[PDB]
Amino acid sequence: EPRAYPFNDVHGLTLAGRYGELQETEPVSRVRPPYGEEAWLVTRYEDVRAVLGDGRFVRGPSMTRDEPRTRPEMVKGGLLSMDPPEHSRLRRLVVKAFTARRAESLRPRAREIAHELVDQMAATGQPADLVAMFARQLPVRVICELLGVPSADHDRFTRWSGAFLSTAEVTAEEMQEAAEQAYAYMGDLIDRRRKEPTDDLVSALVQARDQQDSLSEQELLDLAIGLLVAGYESTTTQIADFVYLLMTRPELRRQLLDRPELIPSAVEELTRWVPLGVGTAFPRYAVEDVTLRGVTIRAGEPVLASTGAANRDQAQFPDADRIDVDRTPNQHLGFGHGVHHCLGAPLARVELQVALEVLLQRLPGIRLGIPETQLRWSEGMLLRGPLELPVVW
Ligand SMILES: CC[C@H]1OC(=O)/C=C/[C@H](C)[C@@H](O[C@@H]2O[C@H](C)C[C@H](N(C)C)[C@H]2O)[C@@H](C)C[C@@H](C)C(=O)/C=C/C=C/[C@@H]1CO[C@@H]1O[C@H](C)[C@@H](O)[C@@H](OC)[C@H]1OC
Ligand code: HEM
Ligand SMILES: [Cl-]
């Protein structure tokens, strides 16, 4: 009886037709994922939003449960495996340091970084791989700048960070060595910023307070590496997917060339439209029986709340499959919802807006250097995105 899940094909960004069918006829349904427990799948915008904001659906069981998932290993921990009130304390300290103003202040340095990466890419001649040379470089260098990793160390830090991408081809030994290097480096950096604070995020984390509460040494190190892995692969993959869309959809490209002031709205529209996850990814667990659209979800059972499907619900977004760069309103769930809503979103927005702005300004002719049908797509099974994007201009 449960349906085989995921439904999305990883070899492209199409939203599986099953989601729309289920939104009509079985909005709360049973799925059997490749690994982990069978689970409830929730597909309507209203219900996804409700699940992600409902106090009765928690993340703590992630720490021990056989979580519904697409890969054989379990990745657990960090802010996203915590529930209030433990979650609330850590999140309050982080956001006090990691402000929207701090994110906005990184725009000039993100633009300089993007310009340098295009310089480097263009110096390799055509076609050049936009994934290797740009998308996989900008977000980790911006996280370096955000944390306060000195310039001289961005290359080595970027190298270690590459080992944590779901697309990496590294042995267990190599990945272990990269993790050890990164945590040792970050622990040192924290220790130096406590002794001699600067204006960067690591210093602001060390000094964040709520009355007498503060982050411990171990919370600081875990949170800083947490920010890196949460803010790297997502952003990289979304850059790659957004430019893939601009290169393949002439009118979309034309509208942003002709009105670059549309880029921030376009970033929101493409965040809504792109079903970036292969599945849903972070199951919620009922703390008690809950009735959702007439179906009883029993205490303990996992629930997969599809933001990809929710963001394409025709009930919430008029003509939901059209990319309308000027769409208003646009209350999309592509940076989540409820207490776990993306705390890097302000920075992610600056990166994505800068990535489009600079690529379109420097390479307005940018296009696929190979037929679209020949693209190699990631089989990492977490996010959907091209493994390489050969581009010409
Ligand atoms: C696709 C995005 C996620 O990528 C991931 O989930 C990346 C997972 C990769 C695939 C893992 O690496 C693979 O592990 C296998 C055992 C072997 C395989 N090779 C070596 C043969 C190897 O490639 C994991 C275990 C790698 C390590 C370094 C790791 O823990 C990386 C985690 C990255 C998490 C990324 C972001 O998710 C964040 O996960 C946290 C656990 C959450 O708390 C939350 O962060 C705040 C979430 O970001 C919202
Ligand atoms: C295009 C890029 C990004 C997208 C699409 C994205 C999306 C998401 C989503 C959908 C969630 C909620 C996951 C859930 O509740 O299951 C999340 C949480 C999170 N994001 Fe992002 N994110 C992006 C970039 C970033 C960046 C740049 C950072 C750090 C600088 C960041 C840090 C985090 C953290 C720490 C969480 C966990 C929050 C919590 O559990 O309290 N993300 N993000
Ligand atoms: Cl850099």
Swiss-Prot record:
Residue ranges, compositional bias (Basic and acidic residues): 64-74
**Listed GO molecular functions?**
heme binding; iron ion binding; monooxygenase activity; oxidoreductase activity, acting on paired donors, with incorporation or reduction of molecular oxygen
Q: Which UniProt keywords apply?
A: Antibiotic biosynthesis, Heme, Iron, Metal-binding, Monooxygenase, NADP, Oxidoreductase
Instruction: Supply the Gene3D superfamilies for this chain.
Output: Cytochrome P450
Q: In which pathway does it act?
A: Antibiotic biosynthesis; mycinamicin biosynthesis
Knockout consequence? Answer: Cells lacking this gene do not produce mycinamicin I, mycinamicin II and mycinamicin V, and accumulate mycinamicin IV.
Its cofactor is: heme
In this chain, substrate is annotated as bound at 77
Relate the outcome reported for changing residue 282 to A/V. Decrease in catalytic activity
InterPro entries the UniProt entry points to = Cyt_P450, Cyt_P450_B, Cyt_P450_CS, Cyt_P450_sf
What is one Pfam family matched by this protein?
Answer: p450
Renumbered to this chain, the signal peptide range is none
* Biological processes per GO annotation: antibiotic biosynthetic process
Task: Specify which residues bind heme according to the UniProt entry for this protein.
Answer: 87, 91, 284, 340, 342
Q: Which EC numbers does the record give?
A: 1.14.-.-
Keyword Metal-binding belongs to the record: yes
* PROSITE patterns linked: CYTOCHROME_P450
Q: Where is this region: Disordered?
A: 59-82
Q: What does this protein do?
A: Involved in the biosynthesis of mycinamicin, a 16-membered macrolide antibiotic. Catalyzes consecutive hydroxylation (at C14) and epoxidation (at C12-C13) reactions with mycinamicin IV as initial substrate, leading to mycinamicin II. These reactions require prior dimethylation of 6-deoxyallose to mycinose for effective conversion by the dual function MycG enzyme.
Of which family is this protein a member? Belongs to the cytochrome P450 family.
What is the protein name given in its UniProt record? Mycinamicin IV hydroxylase/epoxidase
Q: Which organism is it from?
A: Micromonospora griseorubida
